Design a protein around this ligand. Structure first.
Ligand SMILES: *[C@H]1O[C@H](CO[C@]2(C(=O)O)C[C@H](O)[C@@H](NC(C)=O)[C@H]([C@H](O)[C@H](O)CO)O2)[C@H](O)[C@H](O[C@@H]2O[C@H](CO)[C@H](O)[C@H](O)[C@H]2O)[C@H]1NC(C)=O
Lengths: 10, 120
C-alpha cells in the first residue's frame, strides 16, 4: 500500500 | 480520528514518508509532525507494518553507545519477547530500522525512509 503511491504534481 | 492519509490502526495514527533522512533527521521530522518514530513492541504491529511496506524504514530504536541498551523513543527498553525480531549489529551501529518483519541495527548517519506515529 505505502510504497507505490504515485502523487500528482502541484 | 486521524489526519488525512494517516492510517488508523489500533490505538494510533501512522504516517509513511519517502524522504532519505538520517536517524536523527527522521526523529526531528516526526517531531515536526507532532508525532514520534515508531515503537514496534509487539507481534501485531510487526505484521501490520510488514503487510503495508517492503522498503527499509527507520523506527524509534537507538542505543547511546554500542554497549548500552536499545531504547524506544518513550524511554522504554526493548521487550524480551521482541528480541527475536532484532538482528545483531556491529559496534557503532546504534540506530535501527524495520525491514520485512525484522529490525536491523545500522549506522545512524546512513539515510533511509521513515514513518511516524501519533495518538488518535
Ligand atoms: C508526491 O508526493 C510523493 C511522496 O509521497 C508520500 C511519501 O512520502 O511517500 C506518500 C505518503 O503517503 C505521504 N504521507 C502522508 C502521511 O501523507 C507522504 C507525505 O505527503 C509527504 O512525504 C510529506 O512531504 O508523501 C513524492 O514526494 C512525489 O515527488 C516525486 O517523487 C518521485 C519518486 O517518489 C520522483 O522523485 C519525482 O521526481 C518527484 O517529483 C510527489 N509528486 C510530485 C510530482 O511532486
Amino acid at each position: 500500500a505505502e510504497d507505490d503511491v504515485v502523487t500528482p504534481g502541484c | 480520528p486521524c489526519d488525512t492519509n494517516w492510517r488508523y490502526y489500533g490505538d494510533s495514527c501512522y504516517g509513511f514518508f519517502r524522504h532519505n533522512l538520517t536517524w536523527e533527521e527522521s526523529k526531528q521530522y516526526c517531531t515536526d509532525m507532532n508525532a514520534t518514530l515508531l515503537k514496534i513492541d509487539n507481534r501485531n504491529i510487526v505484521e501490520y507494518i510488514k503487510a503495508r511496506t517492503h522498503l527499509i524504514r527507520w523506527v524509534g530504536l537507538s542505543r547511546q553507545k554500542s554497549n548500552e541498551v536499545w531504547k524506544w523513543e518513550d524511554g522504554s527498553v526493548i521487550s524480551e519477547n521482541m528480541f527475536e525480531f532484532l538482528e545483531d549489529g556491529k559496534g557503532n551501529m546504534n540506530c535501527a530500522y524495520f525491514h520485512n518483519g525484522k529490525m536491523h541495527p545500522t549506522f545512524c548517519e546512513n539515510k533511509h525512509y521513515l514513518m511516524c506515529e501519533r495518538k488518535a
